[PDB]
Subunit: 322 residues, 4 copies
């Protein structure tokens, strides 16, 4: 059935989710309401003008309590407490939770009490009880009854997991490490800020075999959009640069088609803006030391490709509602 | 003897070298002339006002052909051809070559023909014929007769080689890889620009045993100053994070004292501005996978620490003139 | 007739010129050759991937000596000396000069000697002898025989002249001043750099009545694209904010249609990227003190809108070739 | 008497105020307590390491409830409600309010109920009931009984009012307009953000004669520190550029000594970091149209000079406690 969706939070992610969804060839989704922290005007404005994605070309019309976008209109409400939401009254099946404040199963499930049947977090789940899925990596494991609260992990994890997946299936990771240099407690505008990252461990969630085999560090840079992951892994099957890039390309044309983008052309950050893939490999940067120490650098468009994956998971969850 | 030095080029490095020299507790160096591409005014202006290091507090007074800084004055000349320089007439022993245009032995030796006995390149040497030295790593191998044209390698190499040195001395590197994310063909102000780096190979020069055992990749970011190196090596002696940071700290208090700074405090880029060490380790970032895959992240102040090392080598070359 | 054009210099402007031209509904132009400083490959690459405008979607194919873009192909040559160019052999009518090195009538006319009949500078003319034209301001004054070397002024002048034009026609400028805060001798990446600007005087060239009535200052900022002009003028006919914005809007729908963009929506820099207008007024920012001290803030997309104007002038010059 | 001061909020301004105070040749101020939102550790860390002002060189030692800096120690407390503070118990005379949340007289006076006799807002006052003073402009009007809650206006106003003062005293402003382009609802890191500014009106408070004679607009840029004001005024006494800069320089050596810095040297943003003056004039940028339209550009170090002025007012308030 075509499930009814409500977007909680209308920031970068919520808005990106909306754009990605419109534009989709087809859909089993039906967005009906958006919970904001501002008015239906501010929403229509932010939804149209993006300092990153650019102006959203589609018929946008606001109203006191709603927002219409190419015919389809949707109720606008403002409640800082999910417990208060009319999720039951509005027959809300799935709730896209993108406020970053409800990431524990119990917190997110406030939407469940409010009457929603299932809630998906556009961020990593904190604690246990949530189901993490990374499209192209473990979506075949998706079963509607496993979790009420599901997660799509993070942007970094979504760029990493696909690559680790392939590398592992083809050469077998023994142990590895990664450094994610990504964009936006100190003036991050003038510094390069070291920070922790769970993306390393998060991959174990969607590739259990890699449990305890990866670890990472994050470095924050004053860059606009596009970010990158630096993956160094020690494999089992010794190989050569040519061949590592070979498998990554195959995957980008098959098993990971639409997920992993294989770029060989000499490019830079900006060039990958608006990319639908959640992980773009830069083949020119691949190195292999002594045939078994592989290093792969992959670019990922911060919240855009992540958003395409979020719509993909909401969709999967629809095509599978029980 | 106190050798007579002439600085060729008065940009980032030349200016930095001057500052670092003044302020040195002692010196066997006597700067007598500076070859610029502008007037003795522009020189005293750029020497006083630094958009990075800040205003240089010292009595600066220009002139039509000279520049006086705290008593000591020095001839200013402008020749875009080293062959034309008055190195012989001015009894110039050592020439600090910092224009980045003469990095091959034959190019740099143009200063030799012009009458200088020895020239030191503030950049990697191109081709063969030059002697690369990284203070704290192979400066004990210095012998005045080996090279007329010597190199101080690069900033990256000067941050990397010390670490590799210690790591290798203590656990023995088998193979490794590094990714330097450093500051300033496409608008680099809006991108993250992948680029090559010889620092990997450079280290083989000052640590021959690591020949063919390291490889790197560089990523250029729109950051102000400080940069960082990401070193992943597979060692022989299995160890633990606590112990890898333990040897690096010993080194910062002994063998690599003054060269390697061991920081454990939670800090960011800016915090390491004006640091004299050419390689600051961020202990909180050290990871060890399965006891034998080590990862070290080190910060380095672009041209400042490098300049401290340049004065260091000029000084060593003095205390050793034959 | 459909004149034959050759683009000298393939940087920001040259490339922008090419994109703008393709995409034009119609044209009396026929680009036949491009003089670069690199190969036909680097050209096709730079023409396809823009860290600003984004990827150029059109069939691009290079070759050893040419470049094809959607059927139309064009000879690629590399000569740092216009005197050497085969402009006569190739029957080059108009030469788009965008290297910034030939801006004096005599320098630019090197293309004339090389056999070209007319040359247009994508920058301000230095000295006398060139014909400056700002589309929408003084293009009705264009006569094919007046000058062999014509100029399109600058981006700033192109944003300013249209506005001054309207304000003047409607209220009559007595005297004014302007400050242009625009994007990319000191690290301009970390500073706000004060610099001179001729745009103020340049306007006199295309609006003689304003001779000696305007003056300006420039402030350079580490911003990506979009820039802005701050125009403060003292008028003759006292007016009110509502009415000043009123005339600017009318103009944007008529006399200055396609030249001046009237934006009332609350927006920012990014929002005006890819704008074809060479001058976007931000009505919300209009102020009028004591009915006769007007201040108008206008945004301009650095080289893009400028490029649309450049194609407009080449076109005008074609439709008028004698 | 040496009044007892308590700093509420320990961010940008609070920290800056502390530094400026230490380092003062003398003082009638005795800082005794600091109300934070974090621990006494985070406080001593942020007080020592500044991504802007650099490392603060002074003996800093924390503790569970206090912080000692060069002998003098001070109680650290954490209450998000001024009403709850121990201002009475700690005999707090003056409270430096720098949290930006209590800017209305009634809000700020919560510190009064808590036992403090006088509170000074490091920001513009909202509504009526507060006394705004701009050192060098209306500090002679200070009288301890006028206001329990006083304001130091803002950084912009503190750069603007001094200039307006002199200009008006010497030529008489009839009407004017200003545009402040200063540093840090949309990603301001990639845009130039237009925003409102009360600095125009603020000046009327410290220079009543200019009531209704000025108006401004602000443009936010992704710049690090220093900002700038663009002042265009129409005067009564016609003058010449040379003479407008002449009075501004006299003022910087007399009446506005220490307040206005007169710079004629060709410099940029960075060059004015750490400047104690709250308004630096860039003479090379002064323009005068038709003898009576004056334009002055002044640089101001965001929060540093402002902080020097804040300590100045606290001090004046001390030397005047009744």
């Amino acid at each position: 059935m075509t499930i009814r969706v409500a977007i909680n939070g209308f920031g970068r992610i919520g808005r990106n989710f909306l754009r990605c969804w419109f534009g989709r060839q087809n859909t089993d989704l039906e967005v009906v309401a958006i919970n904001n922290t501002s008015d239906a005007r501010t929403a229509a404005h932010l939804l149209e003008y993006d300092s990153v994605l650019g102006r959203f070309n589609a018929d946008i019309s606001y109203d006191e309590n709603s927002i219409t976008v190419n015919g389809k209109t949707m109720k606008i409400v403002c409640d800082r407490n999910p417990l208060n939401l009319p999720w039951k009254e509005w027959d809300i099946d799935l709730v896209i939770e993108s406020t970053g404040v409800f990431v524990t199963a119990e917190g997110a499930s406030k939407h469940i009490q409010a009457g929603a049947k299932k809630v998906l977090i556009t961020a990593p789940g904190k604690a246990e009880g949530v189901g993490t899925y990374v499209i192209g990596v473990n979506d075949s494991e998706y079963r509607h009854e496993d979790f009420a609260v599901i997660s799509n992990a993070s942007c970094t994890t979504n760029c990493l997991a696909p690559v680790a997946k392939v590398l592992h299936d083809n050469f077998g990771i023994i142990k590895g490490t990664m450094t994610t240099t990504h964009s936006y407690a100190r003036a991050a505008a003038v510094n390069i800020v070291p920070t922790t990252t769970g993306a390393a461990k998060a991959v174990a969630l969607v590739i259990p075999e890699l449990k305890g085999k990866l670890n990472g560090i994050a470095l924050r840079v004053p860059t606009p959009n596009v970010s990158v992951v630096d993956l160094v892994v020690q494999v089992e099957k010794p190989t050569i640069t040519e061949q590592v890039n070979e498998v990554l390309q195959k995957a980008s044309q098959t098993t990971m088609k639409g997920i992993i983008k294989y770029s060989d052309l000499p490019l830079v950050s900006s060039d990958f803006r608006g990319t639908d893939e959640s992980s773009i490999v830069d083949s020119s940067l691949t190195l292999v030391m002594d045939g078994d120490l592989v290093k792969v650098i992959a670019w990922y468009d911060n919240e855009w490709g992540y958003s395409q994956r979020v719509v993909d998971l909401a969709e999967l969850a629809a095509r599978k509602s029980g």
